[PDB]
Amino acid sequence: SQIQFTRHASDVLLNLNRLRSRDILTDVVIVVSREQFRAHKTVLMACSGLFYSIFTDQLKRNLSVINLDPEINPEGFNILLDFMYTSRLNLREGNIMAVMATAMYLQMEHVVDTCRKFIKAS
Amino acid sequence: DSQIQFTRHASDVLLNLNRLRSRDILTDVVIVVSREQFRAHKTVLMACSGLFYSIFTDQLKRNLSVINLDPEINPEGFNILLDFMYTSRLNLREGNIMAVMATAMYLQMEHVVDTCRKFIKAS
Numbered sequence: 427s428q429i430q431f432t433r434h435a436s437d438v439l440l441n442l443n444r445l446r447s448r449d450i451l452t453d454v455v456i457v458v459s460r461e462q463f464r465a466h467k468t469v470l471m472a473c474s475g476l477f478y479s480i481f482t483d484q485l486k487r488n489l490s491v492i493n494l495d496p497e498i499n500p501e502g503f504n505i506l507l508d509f510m511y512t513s514r515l516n517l518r519e520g521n522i523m524a525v526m527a528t529a530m531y532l533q534m535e536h537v538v539d540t541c542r543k544f545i546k547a548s
Numbered sequence: 549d550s551q552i553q554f555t556r557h558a559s560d561v562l563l564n565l566n567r568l569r570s571r572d573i574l575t576d577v578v579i580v581v582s583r584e585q586f587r588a589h590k591t592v593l594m595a596c597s598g599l600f601y602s603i604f605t606d607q608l609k610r611n612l613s614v615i616n617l618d619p620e621i622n623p624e625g626f627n628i629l630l631d632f633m634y635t636s637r638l639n640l641r642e643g644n645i646m647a648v649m650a651t652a653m654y655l656q657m658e659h660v661v662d663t664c665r666k667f668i669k670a671s
């Protein structure tokens with residue numbers, strides 16, 4: 427017998443995004459071409475297969491500054507990073523290309539799937 | 549303006565954070581509760597507790613790796629609330645209601661406290 431708090435997880439994520447906005451306990455800077463992004467490694471690992479792999483591998487686990495592949499563009503990463511901390515994704519025909527490629531690179535199948543559906547729809 | 553919202557994202561994030569805790573991956577604090585030690589992520593503690601948010605909002609308190617709770621706090625009560633923080637689920641029983649409530653009040657977790665109040669009424 428347990429009590430289920432329906433909004434707990436969502437409330438936790440809100441507060442994690444609050445901490446991100448004020449740069450509290452952020453422990454990694456993601457560099458994407460010309461832009462810097464600060465985040466929590468734990469959240470990154472919780473939302474991306476790439477980051478889960480990096481931060482559990484003996485080569486890159488302790489890095490505090492990560493450089494994504496040059497082909498990734500900052501606009502797409504910003505979108506997916508905001509999704510990580512909000513569960514919300516702003517998808518349009520003008521950014522779907524970048525969003526889908528970034529999500530495939532970050533290994534985030536749900537966004538990829540949603541992108542594929544968005545394409546075959548329009 | 550509008551956007552797509554993934555209804556299960558947050559729950560899966562929390563589950564993966566709990567998996568990292570179980571693996572002791574990127575845990576950055578030890579909470580000492582009488583004779584017991586609990587490892588955790590400050591970020592989750594801050595996101596779930598008014599006490600932990602207040603403590604760790606100080607970068608010098610945030611630098612600490614060992615936090616001793618009030619010695620009067622029951623370790624089983626804290627363990628129940630720690631599991632709750634990482635799962636959204638609270639194991640409330642007649643055998644533990646008093647420890648959970650006192651601990652929830654100490655950690656400044658209103659929803660659990662009020663849940664315990666409703667529980668005590670129903671009993």
Ligand SMILES: Cc1cc(-c2cn(CC(=O)Nc3cc(N4CCOCC4)ncc3Cl)c3nc(-c4cnn(C)c4)n(C)c(=O)c23)cc(C#N)c1O
Nearest residue numbers: 471472473474475478533534535536537557560561564567
């Ligand atoms: C909430 C959310 C999460 C993810 C998402 C997160 N992670 C990383 C991840 O799994 N971390 C953890 C896994 C475990 N394990 C416990 C034992 O069993 C399960 C694994 N423990 C702790 C952590 Cl932290 C993803 N990894 C992949 C992937 C690609 N190749 N492989 C081999 C895996 N794919 C495809 C994904 O989608 C995601 C994506 C989205 C989206 N969109 C999303 O919303």
Ligand SMILES: Cc1cc(-c2cn(CC(=O)Nc3cc(N4CCOCC4)ncc3Cl)c3nc(-c4cnn(C)c4)n(C)c(=O)c23)cc(C#N)c1O
Nearest residue numbers: 437438441444445594595596597598601656657658659660
């Ligand atoms: C999901 C969940 C959360 C909480 C819960 C979490 N926090 C801590 C918290 O808010 N941290 C953050 C706050 C902010 N903001 C602060 C205000 O504006 C600027 C930004 N930014 C990031 C973070 Cl991390 C709580 N603090 C109190 C409390 C008691 N006195 N005071 C003064 C506060 N009470 C009563 C609570 O319940 C909770 C409890 C439960 C339960 N049960 C639960 O399920």
